């Protein structure tokens, strides 16, 4: 029995960044070289660990976050970043130890005349703590008078949509992201290599 990395990477639908998906990998064996040497990836930066020494290591739990963002937005999926995605949608801790893997998904995630399925939070009142997840669809109150579910002046629906058409730019097309975090606790470690 080995880890369901197929269930995450080769899944048909990917979550919206604002509602990122988290899969818990536990009690299994992994081959992180069949990932590193797939040469099908746009971005593969690791942090506080090295990708080729990854199959020699054990962890107590491995976390696989996944979502979709714009290309110019893959830069903010990194420790110490700011911008709408890293501030309001997905933050990584300054002490991050793990890997951030993206690829271009224009093929499946951009639809002719717009893919209005993939969202992001555009309005928030404070920055996210690392690995926070805000799914609130409340009307954003930008003024001093409440909004009471009515969109209007000072009252913005807080989630916008990416256009996502196959005739978009390059760092403006849909990329799928997968963030592999590696945690080690004082508990039996059950995600090792061969």
């Amino acid at each position, epitope marked *: 029995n080995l880890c369901p990395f197929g269930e995450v990477f080769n899944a048909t639908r990917f979550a919206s960044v604002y509602a990122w998906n988290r899969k818990r990998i536990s009690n299994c064996v992994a081959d992180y070289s069949v990932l590193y040497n797939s040469a099908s990836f746009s971005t593969f930066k690791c942090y506080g660990v090295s990708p080729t020494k990854l199959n020699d290591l054990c962890f107590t739990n491995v976390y696989a976050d996944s979502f979709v963002i714009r290309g110019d937005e893959v830069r903010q999926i990194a420790p110490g970043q700011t911008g709408n995605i890293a501030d309001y949608n997905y933050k990584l801790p300054d002490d991050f130890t793990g890997c951030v893997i993206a690829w271009n998904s224009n093929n499946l995630d951009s639809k002719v005349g717009g893919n209005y399925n993939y969202l992001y939070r555009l309005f928030r009142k404070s920055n996210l703590k690392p690995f926070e997840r805000d799914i609130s669809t409340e009307i954003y109150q930008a003024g001093s008078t409440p909004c009471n579910g009515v969109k209007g002046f000072n009252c*913005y629906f807080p989630l916008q949509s990416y256009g996502f058409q196959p005739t978009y730019g390059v760092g403006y097309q849909p990329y799928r992201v997968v963030v592999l975090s590696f945690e080690l606790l004082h508990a039996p470690a059950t995600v090792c290599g061969p």
Partner: antibody, heavy 117, light 109 residues
Framework: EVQLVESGGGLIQPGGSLRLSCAASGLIVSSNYMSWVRQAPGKGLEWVSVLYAGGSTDYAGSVKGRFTISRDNSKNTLYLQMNSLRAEDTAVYYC???????????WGQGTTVTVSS | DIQMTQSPSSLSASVGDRVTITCRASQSISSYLNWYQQKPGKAPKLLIYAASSLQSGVPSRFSGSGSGTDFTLTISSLQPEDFATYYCQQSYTTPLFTFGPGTKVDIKR
């Protein structure tokens, strides 16, 4: 009463400093994308710097490291500190509320900033 | 970086005419595109948001159209206080917007 009230332009020698001010009514700066945009004599609108609701900051290539945009929730006021001013920074400085997809709907009156030796 | 270009740097029109400004983006920005009016010495004034939505308190003769690389501000019946300069602005890269160069409409003679 939605109003943005700029203050603090004037003349300045190159290398000097000015503090621009933008006092607000009818919106909370703390809760908004607040930008400074400038318009040079005869030219158009160039975006300068922005203050995300969460406190992040971004700046134009040209002013990065010379301007710092801040705020005081207490006085509900946007600020732009302009240091090491050059001649090209001569323009009019609008503060404005970026409501993103719904437009830049609220603008200040402007304040003129002239850098010359 | 998206660059916005506006076609007639200056065009002439008489009161009651049907005036058409255009804007063009260097990439497709879908419908993230706003129109502004500026009169000499005053601040910009938002006209259309989201390519086609009329802003509050702006006369119904103003209308927006377009989705992608090309857009159009239309004044249905040009009125005397409408002699101005009209700018387009993309909201695709919020909050780092970039503007158009402007179109100026002056009085035909």
């Amino acid at each position: 009463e939605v109003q943005l009230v700029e203050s603090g332009g004037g003349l300045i020698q190159p290398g000097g400093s000015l503090r621009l001010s933008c006092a607000a009514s009818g919106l909370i700066v703390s809760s908004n994308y607040m930008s400074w945009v400038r318009q040079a004599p005869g030219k158009g609108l160039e975006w300068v710097s922005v203050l995300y609701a969460g406190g992040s900051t971004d700046y134009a290539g040209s002013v990065k490291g010379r301007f710092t945009i801040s705020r005081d929730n207490s006085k509900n006021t946007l600020y732009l500190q302009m240091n090491s001013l050059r001649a090209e920074d001569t323009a009019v400085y609008y503060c404005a509320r970026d409501a993103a997809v719904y437009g830049i709907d609220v603008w200040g009156q402007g304040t003129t900033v002239t850098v010359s030796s | 970086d998206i660059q916005m270009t506006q076609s007639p740097s200056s065009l002439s029109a008489s009161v009651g005419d049907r005036v058409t400004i255009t804007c063009r983006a260097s990439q497709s920005i879908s419908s993230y595109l706003n129109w502004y009016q500026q009169k000499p010495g005053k601040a910009p004034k938002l006209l259309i948001y989201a390519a086609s939505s009329l802003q509050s308190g702006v006369p119904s003769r103003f209308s927006g159209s377009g989705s992608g690389t090309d857009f159009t501000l239309t004044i249905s019946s040009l009125q005397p206080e409408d002699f101005a300069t009209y700018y387009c602005q993309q909201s695709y890269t919020t909050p780092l917007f970039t503007f158009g160069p402007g179109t100026k409409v002056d009085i035909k003679r």
